[PDB]
Amino acid sequence: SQLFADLSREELTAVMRFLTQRLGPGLVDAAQARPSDNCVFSVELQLPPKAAALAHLDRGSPPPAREALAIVFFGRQPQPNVSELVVGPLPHPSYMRDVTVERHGGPLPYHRRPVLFQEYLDIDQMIFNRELPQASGLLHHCCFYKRGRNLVTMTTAPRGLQSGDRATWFGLYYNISGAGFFLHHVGLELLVNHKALDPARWTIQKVFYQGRYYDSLAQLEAQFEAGLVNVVLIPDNGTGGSWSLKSPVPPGPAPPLQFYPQGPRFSVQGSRVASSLWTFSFGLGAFSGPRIFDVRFQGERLVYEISLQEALAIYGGNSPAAMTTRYVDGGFGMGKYTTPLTRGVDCPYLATYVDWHFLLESQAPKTIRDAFCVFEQNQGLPLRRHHSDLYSHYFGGLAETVLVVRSMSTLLNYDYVWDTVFHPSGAIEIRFYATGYISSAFLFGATGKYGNQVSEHTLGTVHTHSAHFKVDLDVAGLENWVWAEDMVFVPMAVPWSPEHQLQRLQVTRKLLEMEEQAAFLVGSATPRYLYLASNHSNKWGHPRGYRIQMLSFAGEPLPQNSSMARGFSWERYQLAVTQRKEEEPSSSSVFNQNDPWAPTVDFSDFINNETIAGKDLVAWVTAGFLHIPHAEDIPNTVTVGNGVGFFLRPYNFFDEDPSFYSADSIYFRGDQDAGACEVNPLACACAPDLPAFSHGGFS
Amino acid sequence: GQSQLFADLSREELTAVMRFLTQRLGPGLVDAAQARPSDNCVFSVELQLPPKAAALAHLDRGSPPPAREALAIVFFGRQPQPNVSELVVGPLPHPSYMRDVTVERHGGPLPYHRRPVLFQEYLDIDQMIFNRELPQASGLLHHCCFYGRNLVTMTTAPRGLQSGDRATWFGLYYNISGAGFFLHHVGLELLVNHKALDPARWTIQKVFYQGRYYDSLAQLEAQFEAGLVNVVLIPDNGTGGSWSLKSPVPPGPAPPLQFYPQGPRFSVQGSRVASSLWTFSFGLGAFSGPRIFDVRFQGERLVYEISLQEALAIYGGNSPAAMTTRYVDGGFGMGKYTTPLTRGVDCPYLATYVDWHFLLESQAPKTIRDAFCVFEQNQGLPLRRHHSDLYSHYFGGLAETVLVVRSMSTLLNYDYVWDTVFHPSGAIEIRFYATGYISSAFLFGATGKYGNQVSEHTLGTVHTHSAHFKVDLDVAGLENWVWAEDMVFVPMAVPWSPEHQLQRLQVTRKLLEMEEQAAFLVGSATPRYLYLASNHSNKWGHPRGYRIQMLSFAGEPLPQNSSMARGFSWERYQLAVTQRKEEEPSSSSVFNQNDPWAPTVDFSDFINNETIAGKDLVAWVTAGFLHIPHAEDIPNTVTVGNGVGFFLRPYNFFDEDPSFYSADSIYFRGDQDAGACEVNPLACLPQAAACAPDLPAFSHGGFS
Ligand SMILES: *[C@@H]1O[C@H](CO)[C@@H](O[C@@H]2O[C@H](CO)[C@@H](O)[C@H](O)[C@H]2NC(C)=O)[C@H](O)[C@H]1NC(C)=O
Ligand SMILES: *[C@@H]1O[C@H](CO)[C@@H](O[C@@H]2O[C@H](CO)[C@@H](O)[C@H](O)[C@H]2NC(C)=O)[C@H](O)[C@H]1NC(C)=O
Ligand SMILES: *[C@@H]1O[C@H](CO)[C@@H](O)[C@H](O)[C@H]1NC(C)=O
Ligand SMILES: *[C@@H]1O[C@H](CO)[C@@H](O)[C@H](O)[C@H]1NC(C)=O
Ligand SMILES: [Ca+2]
Ligand SMILES: [Ca+2]
Ligand SMILES: [Ca+2]
Ligand SMILES: [Ca+2]
Ligand SMILES: [Cu+2]
Ligand SMILES: [Cu+2]
Numbered sequence A: 001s002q003l004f005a006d007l008s009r010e011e012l013t014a015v016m017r018f019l020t021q022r023l024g025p026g027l028v029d030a031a032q033a034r035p036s037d038n039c040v041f042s043v044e045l046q047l048p049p050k051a052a053a054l055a056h057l058d059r060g061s062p063p064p065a066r067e068a069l070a071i072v073f074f075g076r077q078p079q080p081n082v083s084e085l086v087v088g089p090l091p092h093p094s095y096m097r098d099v100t101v102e103r104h105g106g107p108l109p110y111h112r113r114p115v116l117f118q119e120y121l122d123i124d125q126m127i128f129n130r131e132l133p134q135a136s137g138l139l140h141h142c143c144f145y146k147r148g149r150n151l152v153t154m155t156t157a158p159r160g161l162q163s164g165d166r167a168t169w170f171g172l173y174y175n176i177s178g179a180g181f182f183l184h185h186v187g188l189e190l191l192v193n194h195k196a197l198d199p200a201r202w203t204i205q206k207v208f209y210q211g212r213y214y215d216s217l218a219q220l221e222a223q224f225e226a227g228l229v230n231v232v233l234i235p236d237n238g239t240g241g242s243w244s245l246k247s248p249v250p251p252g253p254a255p256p257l258q259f260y261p262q263g264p265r266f267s268v269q270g271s272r273v274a275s276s277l278w279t280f281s282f283g284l285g286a287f288s289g290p291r292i293f294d295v296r297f298q299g300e301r302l303v304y305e306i307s308l309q310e311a312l313a314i315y316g317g318n319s320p321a322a323m324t325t326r327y328v329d330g331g332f333g334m335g336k337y338t339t340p341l342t343r344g345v346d347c348p349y350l351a352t353y354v355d356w357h358f359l360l361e362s363q364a365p366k367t368i369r370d371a372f373c374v375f376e377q378n379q380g381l382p383l384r385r386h387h388s389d390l391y392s393h394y395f396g397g398l399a400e401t402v403l404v405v406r407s408m409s410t411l412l413n414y415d416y417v418w419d420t421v422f423h424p425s426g427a428i429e430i431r432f433y434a435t436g437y438i439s440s441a442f443l444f445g446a447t448g449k450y451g452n453q454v455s456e457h458t459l460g461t462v463h464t465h466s467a468h469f470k471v472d473l474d475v476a477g478l479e480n481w482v483w484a485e486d487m488v489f490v491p492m493a494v495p496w497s498p499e500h501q502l503q504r505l506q507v508t509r510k511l512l513e514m515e516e517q518a519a520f521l522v523g524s525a526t527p528r529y530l531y532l533a534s535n536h537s538n539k540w541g542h543p544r545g546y547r548i549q550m551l552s553f554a555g556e557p558l559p560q561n562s563s564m565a566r567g568f569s570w571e572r573y574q575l576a577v578t579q580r581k582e583e584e585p586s587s588s589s590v591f592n593q594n595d596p597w598a599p600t601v602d603f604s605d606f607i608n609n610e611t612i613a614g615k616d617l618v619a620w621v622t623a624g625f626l627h628i629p630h631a632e633d634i635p636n637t638v639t640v641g642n643g644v645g646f647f648l649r650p651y652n653f654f655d656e657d658p659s660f661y662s663a664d665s666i667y668f669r670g671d672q673d674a675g676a677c678e679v680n681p682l683a684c685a686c687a688p689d690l691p692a693f694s695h696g697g698f699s
Numbered sequence B: 001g002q003s004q005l006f007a008d009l010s011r012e013e014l015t016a017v018m019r020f021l022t023q024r025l026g027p028g029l030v031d032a033a034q035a036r037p038s039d040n041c042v043f044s045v046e047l048q049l050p051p052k053a054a055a056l057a058h059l060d061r062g063s064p065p066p067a068r069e070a071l072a073i074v075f076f077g078r079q080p081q082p083n084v085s086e087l088v089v090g091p092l093p094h095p096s097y098m099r100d101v102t103v104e105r106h107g108g109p110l111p112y113h114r115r116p117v118l119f120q121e122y123l124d125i126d127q128m129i130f131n132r133e134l135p136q137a138s139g140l141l142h143h144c145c146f147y148g149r150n151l152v153t154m155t156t157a158p159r160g161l162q163s164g165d166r167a168t169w170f171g172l173y174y175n176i177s178g179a180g181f182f183l184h185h186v187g188l189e190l191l192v193n194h195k196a197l198d199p200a201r202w203t204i205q206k207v208f209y210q211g212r213y214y215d216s217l218a219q220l221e222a223q224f225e226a227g228l229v230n231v232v233l234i235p236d237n238g239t240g241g242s243w244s245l246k247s248p249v250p251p252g253p254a255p256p257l258q259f260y261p262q263g264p265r266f267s268v269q270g271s272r273v274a275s276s277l278w279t280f281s282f283g284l285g286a287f288s289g290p291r292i293f294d295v296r297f298q299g300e301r302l303v304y305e306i307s308l309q310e311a312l313a314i315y316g317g318n319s320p321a322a323m324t325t326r327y328v329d330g331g332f333g334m335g336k337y338t339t340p341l342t343r344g345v346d347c348p349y350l351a352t353y354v355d356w357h358f359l360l361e362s363q364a365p366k367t368i369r370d371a372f373c374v375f376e377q378n379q380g381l382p383l384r385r386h387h388s389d390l391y392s393h394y395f396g397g398l399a400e401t402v403l404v405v406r407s408m409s410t411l412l413n414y415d416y417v418w419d420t421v422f423h424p425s426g427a428i429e430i431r432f433y434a435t436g437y438i439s440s441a442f443l444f445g446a447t448g449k450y451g452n453q454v455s456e457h458t459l460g461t462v463h464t465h466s467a468h469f470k471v472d473l474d475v476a477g478l479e480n481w482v483w484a485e486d487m488v489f490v491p492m493a494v495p496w497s498p499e500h501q502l503q504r505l506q507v508t509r510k511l512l513e514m515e516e517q518a519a520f521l522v523g524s525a526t527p528r529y530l531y532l533a534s535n536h537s538n539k540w541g542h543p544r545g546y547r548i549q550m551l552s553f554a555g556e557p558l559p560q561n562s563s564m565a566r567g568f569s570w571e572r573y574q575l576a577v578t579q580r581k582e583e584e585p586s587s588s589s590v591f592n593q594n595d596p597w598a599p600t601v602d603f604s605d606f607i608n609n610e611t612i613a614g615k616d617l618v619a620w621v622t623a624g625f626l627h628i629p630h631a632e633d634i635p636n637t638v639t640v641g642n643g644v645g646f647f648l649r650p651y652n653f654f655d656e657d658p659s660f661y662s663a664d665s666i667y668f669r670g671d672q673d674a675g676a677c678e679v680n681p682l683a684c685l686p687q688a689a690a691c692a693p694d695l696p697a698f699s700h701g702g703f704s
Helices: A009-022 A050-059 A100-104 A117-143 A217-225 A320-324 A565-572 B011-024 B052-061 B104-107 B119-145 B218-223 B322-325 B561-571
Strands: A038-046 A067-074 A081-088 A095-098 A151-154 A167-174 A185-193 A203-209 A211-216 A257-259 A267-271 A272-275 A278-285 A288-295 A300-315 A326-328 A353-358 A366-388 A393-410 A414-422 A428-436 A439-444 A449-453 A459-460 A463-473 A479-493 A501-512 A529-537 A544-553 A573-579 A615-627 A645-650 A664-667 B040-048 B069-076 B084-088 B097-100 B150-154 B167-174 B186-191 B203-209 B212-213 B257-259 B266-269 B272-275 B278-285 B289-297 B300-315 B326-327 B352-360 B366-388 B394-411 B413-424 B426-435 B440-442 B451-455 B458-461 B463-473 B479-493 B501-512 B529-535 B542-551 B575-578 B615-627 B646-651 B667-671
Touching: A009 A038, A009 A067, A009 A095, A009 A353, A009 A565, A009 B413, A038 A100, A038 A278, A050 A257, A050 B366, A081 A100, A081 A272, A117 A151, A117 A167, A117 A217, A151 A278, A151 B426, A167 A320, A185 A320, A203 A217, A203 A320, A211 A217, A217 A326, A217 B167, A267 A366, A267 B300, A278 A366, A278 A414, A288 A393, A300 A414, A300 A428, A300 A565, A320 B501, A326 A565, A366 B167, A366 B366, A366 B394, A414 B097, A414 B366, A428 A463, A463 A565, A463 B529, A501 B322, A544 A573, A544 A615, A565 A573, A565 A615, A565 B040, A615 A645, B011 B040, B011 B069, B011 B084, B011 B097, B011 B352, B040 B084, B084 B104, B119 B150, B119 B167, B119 B186, B119 B218, B167 B394, B167 B413, B186 B440, B203 B218, B203 B322, B203 B451, B212 B218, B257 B529, B266 B366, B272 B394, B278 B366, B278 B394, B278 B440, B289 B394, B289 B413, B300 B413, B300 B426, B300 B575, B326 B561, B426 B463, B463 B561, B463 B646, B479 B542, B542 B615, B615 B646
Parallel strands: A185 A439, A366 B426, A428 B366
Antiparallel strands: A038 A067, A038 A353, A067 A081, A081 A095, A151 A167, A167 A185, A185 A203, A203 A211, A257 B257, A267 A272, A272 A278, A278 A288, A288 A300, A300 A326, A300 A463, A353 A366, A366 A393, A393 A414, A393 A664, A414 A428, A428 A645, A439 A459, A449 A459, A463 A615, A479 A501, A479 A529, A479 A615, A529 A544, A544 A645, A573 A615, B040 B069, B040 B352, B069 B084, B084 B097, B150 B167, B167 B186, B186 B203, B203 B212, B266 B272, B272 B278, B278 B289, B289 B300, B300 B326, B300 B463, B352 B366, B366 B394, B394 B413, B394 B667, B413 B426, B426 B646, B440 B458, B451 B458, B463 B615, B479 B501, B479 B529, B479 B615, B529 B542, B542 B646, B575 B615
16 A cells, blocks of 8 residues: 555656656756756655655545655756745645745755755866866876776765865776775875855865875976976775786586575565555665665554665875765765666575666666565574473474565665664564775875774775664654663672572663653663563453664764754663654754754754653664775675674563464474374475566666 | 694494493493483583684694593582583594592582583473372363463572572473463562472472462462462463464465576585685584684684583563573573574575584484574675776675674573674674564553553563674684774864864774783773784784674673572673683583582683783673664564674784685676676676576474
């Protein structure tokens, strides 16, 4: 019942025509736009309000209007703004409202605007045509200069030092064919100022070569020709790992393949997955990325919403690009930068794969093929098991099979894997792996307070990753409270021999009444059992709870003292529980990246000393680690050990383990024929006949 | 050097050591399965691991292998001062000698009460409970419990309150057919004193019924018939979950099954597993449990030994049984209590399964069928992957497949799953799940400071699970140090706009020089990068490291203040790194369970202020969680979320990710046909390369 389905291609074209016809002429296609134009940057699903949605899904009411949200760069005017416009209803839009002010209390400063694909292209024209030839002598002598065809540019982080700046540090790298350029930094770094609406007016504020700072490329080339700059010649091709992805070893016998002996045990219709146990809807926001809604275990709802909010990456280093860099990846877009899943590599070969349609930086809706995969996975583990050789002879267990939804977001070098996994015990696991290439610096000098040499001439820069999740649990209805259970030892005299002492173990329950009590900072410890719960109880009279259980190796957060830190105040928390308000739909924003100093959304604002005793609650989970890159990250960072996320786990929510009622259960007694088919289902063509491999392709 | 030094004893070898001991132990030597306290007894015979010097000498430098010997534990009960003794017996397979290492190892005789409780001993206790004692309470027992064939006993933990005690609290439970009796405690608990060598002399120290203490079952029945006890009728049958394991739902369509399209890609020969990438030996200690030795990635050794050392379970509760209970399961035995893996449940259906032979509390070697399973598992995840739409058009990834060894130890109610999993990146994951049934109390009174109601009349008692692992890494040779890498922010002026401040991120490396510095307590925080390393370095000049990365939600440890805490000192640590000594083989002992007050091994002794700069090092990793039982543990505790253990991860050990050279890797350009077979191995699985096997007909390893 498809309220939460990302927009169809029809629905996008429809909103795009509507916007065209009503936004004034002189409306330029975003992929070609200059700063001083008008521009549709984004069109995408605007999620409905929760009231109306549940009204419809639970109480049969009519659905809420299906609307879209378009971001429009209004560059052609005295005071340029960015504007968010709601456009509905679908599929025949008749209205368009400008929610900008009602939402962020004022206009959106034009510098918060994400850097357009055209803008990057215009910056590379200035760099390679006007600027770089001024240093053609150095670049011949260090990096095989040709007129800028062999070199290539990569963005950084927040752009400038202060609200309203738009000055970006750019590294230069060899333009490696068929493998990651990110490892071949050439040592040159340019602070480009591109705030102006007129690209002609763009300057080059600073330069960095090989340990030293200059004021222009002309000054650097003065100092080189004056023989005053020791230049080293950096190789340009090479072999293995640092240069390739292609294995030299020929393919061996084949890895284990999984198939479904008697057909799949789940279906995907549109945005809705359904199985014997689990029902839910799914999607990608363009900037927020993955999300699932209306998660229903055996037909009862557990969560209204679980959704990625933000990923973050804080670097340090020798060079100015590295030490400035704090990527707030929502400002690029986790959904925009989704990539095709490659069958049999990113997901089981036999998974069902679904496309994703989007309208971003174009006026055509485009489509990313195989963006999502959904599949059942046999884990190899038992979910549960007991073998009794004692007093009575029996065995009873159950191999865990798991249901899984996966997207992958390729933000330049990094490939983020997002997983939503659905256990047959009633638990939901959320997971986040980082693979892909490292972002690297040129090796020079004081290295080692800042990272590891990881190839010739390559410094693997130290950095943290963090990601933020919204968990809108509705545990047995809307009104939830949060409990914190834990443990304690209490010295006591042994009752039946009181001259003797015994350390008496005891549970510890405190009911958290206030937002501030449930806001938990990185660094401080936290209750071992922490769960959202209901007024209602299970058979045995305990409050029905879903428990959050995290998996994080937190990096130390950017210190509060920094002006920047407000653009990601969620980084400072492990976990926070909050009154769930419509005015507070998201934890970061697409506009924080390019101005964290005046944050377009500041998460610490949500924690504001209200009650959380019997309210519609939402948990916010931070997860992440520290990364000191090392030789085994070349060519890619591996998944092993880097899984982070959390478990949502039943806690007296049921009256017993629901897997007890599993169809795939197994039991037998000592006195039975354990290998007779009427006692044991395991005791019973040309099996998997496979789809011919396909690929979603490239840009 | 081609020998299998690390192989659990075969059955011929066990019979041989048994025969030898028989002939040479004096006559009047009784079979342990039928032995009384005052008898002589062979409790255990099992492989004695060789000394490291000699073993490597052989394995690396070609020298001859060290004498393969066995270690027998012998209960010497027939004498003025009864001892336990450990005897080495070799060489095999034709033993010619036997020495009594008891004194040489633990500085003195082994006090007889440290001995584990024999199967006969438990039976003699049950004879005293059901024949002599329990009928004195026959009135009560009719009224409440449908009265001694319908009831059944279960042990506890340390036995007493003081070194030398041997008095055990025993719960009484309905003798439920075909499902866990552990959930049906009837409310009666008997403190039995069985220290004496004459079972006739055994007493019943105290009694506990439904909230109240009494001095004997006779005085309980006085007060019952005097109408002075409010007695609670506890049902005897029931349905679903609290009573069954058998699902009422009929089998549906089949779950995913995994097979190897063109043969297996590993082999098990005896104790030795071998694959394209990983080569290692494996076994069970009878009491220690799981262990692997001589682990070699692509031919180079990473670890000499990884071995379970102890599991622990500290309980609390309303009732005396629960609040006393601290299991040190080594004292029962993780190997002894291994159980058959049930194919297609405990491991993949097509995994290769291996038996385990043992001689314990008998004179015949017996065999546990399907005790281990080894298998490759496709994980679904990529190990690694990158899709470039930027500047150049390519794709390069690799689905992670993994190699796995698994044993399962069923210690009465609990089924521990031990996993050792071998990633193709060079990492080694160690894992530990607990499923099975909960140990439960009768629900009564101020419950809730002590756990959760989990069925009618059943309290799920709170507890902690902790396990201890020995990790003897030999990173690029024997001489290792430990480094602690971490991070810091340093306020600074932005160099190009000094007016402006920037929070400067930096790496932090300190080299830990002393044992105490690398001993990290539960509760303390602890370096984010902690690794053992070499004098030697990789191509780029950083020291060659394997890094320990833990996965623990540790309970608070038993407070030091308790006399008992010495028996498991390792609980108090997350991690410790130690000079690896032969005198210090193991972290716990089979003899701690029944006397933690005077501990037969005390782990804190190992941490004693020596250097760990450039020595043969051994890390000790504790892992564990808190468990407040809850409805969803009925009938069994589930695995999901309760995986605990650690990763051993390369850290500038190689010059690059070795999976770069994988056979299973995948790459193609934008300008290529991604679905052509000469470009992409995956575009042939259909065409021809499928065909699921005919499966082996299901078998089962059976029961006692
Ligand atoms: C941002 O700019 C847009 C136009 O570029 C503003 O919207 C227009 O406002 C005028 C009156 O201010 C109307 O007559 C038009 O019909 C409006 N067009 C639309 C689509 O809104 C908008 O007011 C500006 N926002 C702010 C807060 O400055
Ligand atoms: C533990 O018990 C054994 C016998 O039960 C003792 O061993 C015997 O000791 C006598 C005299 O020392 C010898 O002549 C026997 O032949 C020994 N038997 C064996 C096989 O060792 C043992 O010495 C006792 N240990 C201690 C320290 O009490
Ligand atoms: C970079 O290299 C690729 C192929 O190796 C080429 O197709 C592309 O046009 C080059 N130029 C730039 C700067 O993108
Ligand atoms: C316990 O139950 C089993 C039935 O499975 C039976 O064989 C046995 O006799 C019963 N009695 C005792 C005390 O074990
Ligand atoms: Ca709030
Ligand atoms: Ca809620
Ligand atoms: Ca020592
Ligand atoms: Ca070592
Ligand atoms: Cu990283
Ligand atoms: Cu438990």
